[PDB]
Design a protein around this ligand. Structure first.
Ligand SMILES: [Mg+2]
Ligand SMILES: [Mg+2]
Ligand SMILES: [Mg+2]
Ligand SMILES: [Mg+2]
Ligand SMILES: [Mg+2]
Ligand SMILES: [Mg+2]
Ligand SMILES: [Mg+2]
Ligand SMILES: [Mg+2]
Ligand SMILES: [Mg+2]
Ligand SMILES: [Mg+2]
Ligand SMILES: [Mg+2]
Ligand SMILES: [Mg+2]
Ligand SMILES: [Mg+2]
Ligand SMILES: [Mg+2]
Ligand SMILES: [Mg+2]
Ligand SMILES: [Mg+2]
Ligand SMILES: [Mg+2]
Ligand SMILES: [Mg+2]
Ligand SMILES: [Mg+2]
Ligand SMILES: [Mg+2]
Ligand SMILES: [Mg+2]
Ligand SMILES: [Mg+2]
Ligand SMILES: [Mg+2]
Ligand SMILES: [Mg+2]
Ligand SMILES: [Mg+2]
Ligand SMILES: [Mg+2]
Ligand SMILES: [Mg+2]
Ligand SMILES: [Mg+2]
Ligand SMILES: [Mg+2]
Ligand SMILES: [Mg+2]
Ligand SMILES: [Mg+2]
Lengths: 291, 170, 199, 190, 106, 128
RNA sequence: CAUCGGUUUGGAGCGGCAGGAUAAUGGCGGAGGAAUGUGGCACGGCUUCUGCUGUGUGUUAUAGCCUCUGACGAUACUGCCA
RNA sequence: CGAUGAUUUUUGCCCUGCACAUUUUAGAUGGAUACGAAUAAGACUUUUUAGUCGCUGGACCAUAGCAGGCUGGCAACGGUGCGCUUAGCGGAAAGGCUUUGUGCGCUUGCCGGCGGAUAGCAAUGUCAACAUGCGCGGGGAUAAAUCCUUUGCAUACGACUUAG
């Protein structure tokens, strides 16, 4: 027999499995599509979630009852010191997907980003990138040859940039290193832009303007193991239910003699990778600004 | 693969009738065992005679008179369908009377699902005059200076693989 | 009828199931087969019917866990692989070895871009189907069912055809020079004897 | 029945040079050239003379025979497209709301812009096909002239304009508003 | 001579079998270049060698041979039936055998 | 002009020479169907055959009336000298070379290899 | 390996004999006939008549075919060969 | 499945030449011999309406020498193998395709002298590429992770984010 009454399903089947994220750093799964006619520019930036605040703003929405009237809105602060460009990666269009051909690095790396490649920095000889730093041998023609290969064969160019986490109040000293796709211009223009920006700082005001709409990639808050009642928002069973009530009463019909993948089950809640879109930029503040 | 047979039979003589009339039929059969069987099948459709009360007098193959002269044959048929019994008339081009009949059995099997058991051959006639031809699908081959190519030739290969591109010219 | 070390088949113009059965029997009998240009394969019947066929295949999935069900591969090479694997005792060790004897590709990647590709007349679409019938190209059905790399393949195939055309232009010139050289050595003692021998 | 052979005769006027090779017809006339690929049909061509062409189907069944006179008609339409042109006249039909039609150019493309159709605030835009000429008739009120060498493009653009002006959620026997093809002729009058 | 072969190339295809039952005492062999029983009838009675390698040396050799002979043709495409002094092991399906030109009758 | 590319097919007509079984010549004397013809020749039996079993050659025996008997076919074949016309084509020459190759012995094959070595030496000298 | 004997599967196997409408055809000779009418002839459209071609006429002509037949000679097919 | 960093002073590692011995091989035993496109059309010289072709690869290249020995000559100044070397192209999985000069061979393109037996009338009568190990010889470099303590951006325990 059918359910006595119909009701929508609890939870979304498009965010499965509700498992922990593979990394704590949210990764850009997909970048904006490249337009050659645009100037060469970055498409992303890394920051740290500081906290929330409140603002008051005059609304410009004709036809609304709050038009030209003050509204009180929640806002989030993202601490964003300028990121340092340290590398460049070339990607090739293949019948099996994009494939990285070569990665070219900068000559000098700061200690906070060189700690990224170590689990025990204090016990190490800190040998990372020393022979590669030696690759800059005079003509540094190995580097120019690889960059020319990227220019010749790559169709997608992404830069390698890291945060300056020593400028944040965090006690962690490891920087966060990420790939940021370069959009705009020809492949040669992108490669020239990446090389000329090696070991240089790029600020947020060079990637995002105010009043822009941007997306946020992040790993959500972890809550550990959770029962179905709070993990999935299922109906609590009656107060007088034997063996407890924070359950789903029926987890399947008799046939198929298995539990379906669509049934809500207890498990780990939070710490998921999410891509959230259309967050408006109310302010791009500057650390040097005293106001 | 058929042959045309002349089968002659009669009722068994009685003291009342000591020379019964001799009746002949032209039978298209694969062999002489089926030729004498079909004879009795049709005589019992017409005459008060049986195989037990009759006698086969002669069985002879009837060969084509001019087996290398191209002819047009008209065949009159009476066949049984799934629903009723029907008369039909069809025309065939062939060099032997037997080879036109072989085509007829293939033809009613293919377009009407009429089995050998469901067909009576009423008459096979060679059409002497070009005006005697009633059917279009064989009249179109009686035009003067008939030419036509054979486009899209498919060649059967003895080998599985060929190292050059296939062609269909001809 | 010869045993080859590797047989590389150009899949253009081949009917999927006839080629699949022939290749299955080939790899079962110990012959190594590589099939290239699976995007140019053909299936008899119009495109819409085959799209409906793929949706019937897609309909089928394990109810209690979709990850256990049939894995509907969308690539032309993997469609051909499903056709062949349905024709192989693939759950035995012998069938697994036979499947190890086979390779299938879209386009013509290295090293096969500089080797000889053959055809299979018993499985060619232009020789089997009635000249009025409608057929499907597996590349369009694959794009229509989720395959993402059609335009990459056509860009790389035009690049390959440009290199192969330079190849052919060079071979014709050296073939032209050798024919002029073979004419000089005609009516010579070796040439006269070879004419009496049939050469 | 598998007819042994079927024929159709193209007629080439005096100033026209048809040119056929591998089922790609290129017809040249005073008004220009038009080409069409027929690789989806099995037909063969014989040049009878400079003014006539034989079009043959060998051993074709009923449907494959049906595809022969259509080839004849398409090539004849090509010939009259390069020797006389094509002209479709459309009349603007409205009961209450006048239809405001403009020939605009947006994004480097020509468009037919229909406004106020049945009072809608919506602005209808129809892309003008390549090789197709639009004109607002001066001699006639509420008339559009669609002209060009290719009959297929002209009639299909005209059909686009007619179809975009369909009436929804009403009795179309009563609400007869729309843009309809009123005259189908040629650039060169006969 | 760059070539030294004195045998005809063959392949071990199958045992004699129905849908479900196999007969190991007879192997079905495909002779290379043979496409008809008329072509295959040349090879009737010729002895056959399956040459393989083993871990242990026997008389200093790691190469072993199983000998057989052609008994009859099989089917219509020039395969033959063979009878070996020991049945060919099932792992050898698809392995190449050597079809000797003797006993010669040329 | 018009410049229409016409097909260069071989036609089914009275007088077409055909090959049968890669061995024997014959000519079509009358058409039976789309599939069957009546063929005759000096070295073949006058018979009704299917067109799938024969191959049309590019040669037509000129002025052969439809339905001509064996004597007429032989007479016109001799007059038109069809055997010589056939024997001059590359098709028959390739067939003859195939038969001749098939009749070689091992010693003749060794001589073929040696002569090929000599001619290849001369050809390479010519190419340089 | 040879040879034998028993059983058995074959060859592009080879030959002789018998039967039939004592095959039917075909080929040769003769007689007759017609048309999907060869040559020729009469009107035409494109050709310096460059298989030019279309329509008429009529009966071997600068092709042939059909029917009947006279005297030979084969083959297919089916059996037998101790 | 890809790019990239560092890769153990440990008698431990990498790269490389030879040499040897072993285990493995879904099964070497002359050569996987490269346009594209159409098929009611193609392909060659050409260049396109002309000649010729297909009607299968029963083709093409290679193929002689104690599994191919020891020596000599001639004709040509070519062919081929290997080793250095010059330059270029190839990123779809390029790992290959070309190329300059040089040195060392071979050449069956042609002609000579010498050798093979006894493995006994067959017995695969043992000749290949992948892998690993080991001796010499040569170029090169000289790390990390985990436990622990700690953290709480994490957490039932594992695991995870930090720091030492
Ligand atoms: Mg219920
Ligand atoms: Mg319900
Ligand atoms: Mg639902
Ligand atoms: Mg996640
Ligand atoms: Mg993406
Ligand atoms: Mg939830
Ligand atoms: Mg209660
Ligand atoms: Mg209770
Ligand atoms: Mg019929
Ligand atoms: Mg080819
Ligand atoms: Mg499918
Ligand atoms: Mg198996
Ligand atoms: Mg998906
Ligand atoms: Mg309605
Ligand atoms: Mg209403
Ligand atoms: Mg048995
Ligand atoms: Mg004859
Ligand atoms: Mg005894
Ligand atoms: Mg015996
Ligand atoms: Mg016997
Ligand atoms: Mg006799
Ligand atoms: Mg007679
Ligand atoms: Mg007379
Ligand atoms: Mg006349
Ligand atoms: Mg007999
Ligand atoms: Mg082996
Ligand atoms: Mg070569
Ligand atoms: Mg070749
Ligand atoms: Mg020497
Ligand atoms: Mg070895
Ligand atoms: Mg401590």
């Amino acid at each position: 027999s059918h359910r006595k009454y119909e009701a929508p399903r609890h939870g979304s089947l498009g965010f499965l499995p509700r498992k922990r994220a593979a990394k704590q750093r949210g990764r850009v799964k997909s970048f904006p599509k490249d337009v050659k006619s645009k100037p060469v520019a970055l498409t992303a930036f890394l920051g740290y979630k500081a906290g929330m605040t409140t603002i008051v703003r005059d609304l410009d929405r004709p036809g609304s009852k709050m038009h030209k009237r003050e509204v009180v809105e929640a806002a989030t602060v993202v601490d964003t010191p300028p990121m340092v460009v340290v590398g460049v990666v070339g990607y090739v269009e293949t019948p099996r997907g994009l494939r990285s051909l070569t990665t070219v690095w900068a000559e000098h790396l700061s200690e906070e980003v060189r700690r990224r490649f170590y689990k025990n920095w204090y016990k190490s000889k800190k040998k990372a990138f020393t022979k590669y730093s030696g690759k800059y041998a005079t003509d540094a023609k190995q580097v120019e040859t690889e960059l020319a290969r990227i220019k010749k064969y790559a169709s997608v160019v992404r830069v390698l940039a890291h945060t300056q986490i020593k400028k944040t109040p965090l006690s962690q000293k490891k920087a966060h290193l990420a790939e940021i796709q370069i959009n705009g211009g020809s492949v040669s223009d992108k490669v020239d832009w990446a090389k000329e920006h090696f070991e240089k700082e790029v600020s947020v005001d060079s990637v995002f303007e105010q009043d822009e709409m941007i997306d946020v990639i992040a790993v959500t808050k972890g809550h550990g193991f959770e029962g179905v009642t709070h993990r999935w928002g299922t109906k609590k069973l009656p107060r007088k239910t034997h063996r407890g009530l924070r359950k789903v009463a029926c987890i399947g019909a008799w046939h198929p003699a298995n539990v379906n993948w669509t049934v809500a089950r207890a498990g780990q809640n939070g710490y998921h990778h999410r891509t959230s879109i259309n967050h408006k930029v109310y302010r791009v503040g500057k650390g040097t600004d005293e106001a | 693969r058929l042959n045309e047979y002349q089968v002659i039979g009669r009722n068994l003589p009685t003291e009342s009738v000591p020379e019964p009339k001799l009746f002949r039929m032209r039978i298209f059969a694969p062999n002489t065992v089926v030729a004498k069987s079909r004879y009795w099948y049709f005589l019992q459709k017409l005459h008060k005679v049986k195989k037990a009360s009759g006698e086969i007098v002669s069985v002879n193959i009837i060969s084509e008179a001019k087996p290398t002269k191209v002819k047009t044959f008209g065949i009159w048929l009476r066949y049984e369908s799934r629903s009723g019994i029907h008369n039909m008339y069809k025309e065939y081009r062939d060099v032997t009377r037997v080879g036109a009949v072989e085509t007829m059995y293939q033809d009613l099997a293919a377009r009407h699902r009429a089995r050998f058991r469901s067909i009576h051959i009423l008459k096979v006639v060679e059409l002497e005059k070009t005006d005697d031809v009633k059917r279009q699908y064989v009249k179109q081959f009686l035009t003067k200076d008939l030419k036509f190519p054979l486009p899209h030739r498919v060649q059967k290969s003895k080998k599985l693989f060929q190292a050059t591109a296939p062609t269909t010219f001809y | 009828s010869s045993f080859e070390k590797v047989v590389v088949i150009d899949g253009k113009g081949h009917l999927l199931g006839r080629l699949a059965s022939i290749v299955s029997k080939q790899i079962l009998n110990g012959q190594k087969v590589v099939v290239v240009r699976c995007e140019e394969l053909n299936i008899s019947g119009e495109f819409f019917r085959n799209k409906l066929k793929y949706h019937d295949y897609l309909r089928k999935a394990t109810r209690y866990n979709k990850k256990k069900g049939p894995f509907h591969f969308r690539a032309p090479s993997r469609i051909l692989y499903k056709a062949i694997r349905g024709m192989i005792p693939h759950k035995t060790a012998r069938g697994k070895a036979a499947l190890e004897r086979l390779k299938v590709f879209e386009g013509v990647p290295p090293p096969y871009d500089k080797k000889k590709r053959v055809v299979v007349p018993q499985a060619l679409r232009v020789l089997r189907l009635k000249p009025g019938r409608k057929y499907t190209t597996v590349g369009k059905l694959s794009s229509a069912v989720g395959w993402k790399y059609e335009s990459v393949v056509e860009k790389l195939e035009e690049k390959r055809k440009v290199q192969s055309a330079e190849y052919y232009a060079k071979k014709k010139a050296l073939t032209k020079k050798l024919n002029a050289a073979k004419a000089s050595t005609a009516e010579s003692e070796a040439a006269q004897k070879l004419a009496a021998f049939g050469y | 029945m598998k007819y042994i052979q079927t024929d159709q005769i193209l007629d080439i006027p005096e100033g026209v040079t048809v040119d056929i090779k591998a089922r790609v017809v290129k017809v040249t006339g005073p008004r220009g050239e038009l080409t069409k690929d027929l690789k989806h049909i099995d037909v063969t061509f014989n040049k009878i003379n400079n003014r006539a062409i034989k079009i043959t189907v060998h051993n074709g069944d009923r449907k494959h025979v049906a595809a022969l006179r259509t080839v004849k008609s398409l090539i004849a339409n090509l010939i009259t497209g390069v020797t006389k042109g094509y002209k479709y006249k459309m009349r603007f039909v409205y009961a209450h709301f006048p239809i405001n039609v403009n020939i605009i150019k947006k994004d480097g493309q020509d468009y037919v812009e229909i406004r106020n159709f049945l009072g809608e605030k919506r602005v209808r835009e129809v892309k003008i096909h390549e090789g197709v000429t639009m004109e607002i008739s001066s001699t006639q009120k509420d008339e559009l002239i669609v002209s060009g060498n290719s009959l297929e493009a002209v009639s299909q653009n005209a059909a686009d304009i007619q179809q975009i002006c369909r009436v929804r959620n009403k009795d179309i026997r009563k609400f007869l508003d729309g843009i309809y093809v009123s005259e189908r002729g040629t650039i060169v009058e006969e | 001579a760059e070539s030294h072969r004195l045998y005809v190339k063959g392949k071990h295809i199958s045992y004699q079998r129905s849908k479900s039952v196999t007969n190991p005492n007879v192997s079905l062999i495909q002779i290379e270049g043979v496409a008809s029983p008329k072509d295959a009838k040349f090879y009737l009675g010729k002895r056959i060698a399956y040459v393989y390698r083993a871990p242990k040396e026997i008389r200093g050799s790691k190469i072993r041979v199983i000998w057989g002979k052609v008994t009859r043709t099989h089917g219509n495409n020039g395969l033959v039936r063979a009878n070996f002094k020991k049945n060919l092991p099932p792992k050898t399906f698809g392995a190449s055998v050597r079809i000797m030109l003797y006993p010669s009758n040329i | 002009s018009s410049t229409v590319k016409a097909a260069n097919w071989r036609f089914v007509e009275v007088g077409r020479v055909v090959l049968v079984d890669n061995k024997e010549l014959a000519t079509i004397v009358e058409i039976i169907d789309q599939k069957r013809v009546l063929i005759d020749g000096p070295k073949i039996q006058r018979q009704a055959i299917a067109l799938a079993k024969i191959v049309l050659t590019p040669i037509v025996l000129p002025n052969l009336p439809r339905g001509s008997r064996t004597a007429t076919v032989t007479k016109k074949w001799a007059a038109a000298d069809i055997d010589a016309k056939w024997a001059a084509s590359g098709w028959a020459k390739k067939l003859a070379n195939k038969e001749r190759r098939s009749q070689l012995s091992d010693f003749e094959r060794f001589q073929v290899m040696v002569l090929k070595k000599q001619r290849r030496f001369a050809t390479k000298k010519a190419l340089v």
